[PDB]
Design a protein around this ligand. Structure first.
Ligand SMILES: C[C@@](O)(CBr)CCOP(=O)(O)OP(=O)(O)O
Ligand SMILES: C[C@@](O)(CBr)CCOP(=O)(O)OP(=O)(O)O
Ligand SMILES: [Mg+2]
Ligand SMILES: [Mg+2]
Ligand SMILES: [Mn+2]
Ligand SMILES: [Mn+2]
Lengths: 180, 176
């Protein structure tokens, strides 16, 4: 598994093995983040497993990951939803295409990413992958946003950064409608 | 270190080594929980180390622990305050003396405790023991309650159950 390296502007220059790529000195690379809603409009929040190299044991949005060579961002969303959560989804919608961020985790690991954000609906039951996700909750988006506003430090920084972007937040809101 | 085994009434009936005591089948034993506030009235919230056997990596109140045989609850609080956080405190005050709870963490480790709750003020700076605490935050109690009320799953279930008890929330709200 690898990551797609990017330079100063957002242009690909090559690839790099994924573990080896996430260190105290992580270079810029391509990622995605997704927010998943069930038919009832509840948001899936997940807790990263304790074995993740970066932000292990941390509460965050539904799924994130790293597109591979030849993969579109949307296929990467679909693949990681299957891998981490075993779940089928509707075509992922682009809700924050220019999100980019750099952050250091509690033990020193850095994520440095160009990270377009998506939202989708789940169309199957979950089969959680315990190597990736250690806990989860189906919640009202309103509640999640109130908690992020009261105690943002309790959640991953990327989750918080995406949730307070005005435009992304309106799209999350639209996914809370009940759909049969 | 051990934990004190309790019968159906809270009577001590024996002890177990502390690590060996917390399993998927944890038996009832004695514990404490404490909420620490600084001189400014801010609440210390901590994140348990990833090495803790129960609820590793979970955001929770300031310091919790297990009194030893013959040790007062208050002395246990003062002991663990020193051990986990390097901090001196004022005499612990009771805020929820009959709290009792049983829960199972994401990996299946259970806590099963008679767990009186206290509150105190810090009188020195923190010196963090990273074998116990991996992160922490000084915050306004109001904000922490709002967070517990909105997303309780983001915090330890014991922190939530304490903060949601009417009286306890009452008494906590006065340390600010
Ligand atoms: C964590 C992040 O959103 C920033 C981007 C990477 O997501 P992951 O840490 O989950 O990456 P994967 O291990 O590929 O799933
Ligand atoms: C789990 C509990 O709050 C009830 C009491 C135990 O707290 P800890 O799990 O932090 O106990 P120690 O490891 O002794 O510090
Ligand atoms: Mg992932
Ligand atoms: Mg403790
Ligand atoms: Mn990455
Ligand atoms: Mn215990």
């Amino acid at each position: 598994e690898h990551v797609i390296l990017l330079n100063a502007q957002g242009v690909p220059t090559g690839t790099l093995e994924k573990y080896a790529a996430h260190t105290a000195d992580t270079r810029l690379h391509l990622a995605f983040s997704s927010w998943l809603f069930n038919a009832k409009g509840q948001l899936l929040v997940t807790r990263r497993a304790l074995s993740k190299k970066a932000w292990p044991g941390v509460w965050t949005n539904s799924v994130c990951g790293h597109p591979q060579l030849g993969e579109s961002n949307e296929d990467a969303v679909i693949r990681r939803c299957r891998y981490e959560l075993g779940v089928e989804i509707t075509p992922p919608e682009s809700i924050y295409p220019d999100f980019r961020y750099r952050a250091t985790d509690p033990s020193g690991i850095v994520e440095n990413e160009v990270c377009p954000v998506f939202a989708a609906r789940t169309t199957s039951a979950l089969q959680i992958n315990d190597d990736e996700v250690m806990d989860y909750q189906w919640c009202d988006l309103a509640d999640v946003l109130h908690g992020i506003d009261a105690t943002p430090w309790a959640f991953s920084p990327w989750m918080v950064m995406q949730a307070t972007n005005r435009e992304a937040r309106k799209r999350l809101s639209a996914f809370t409608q009940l759909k049969l």
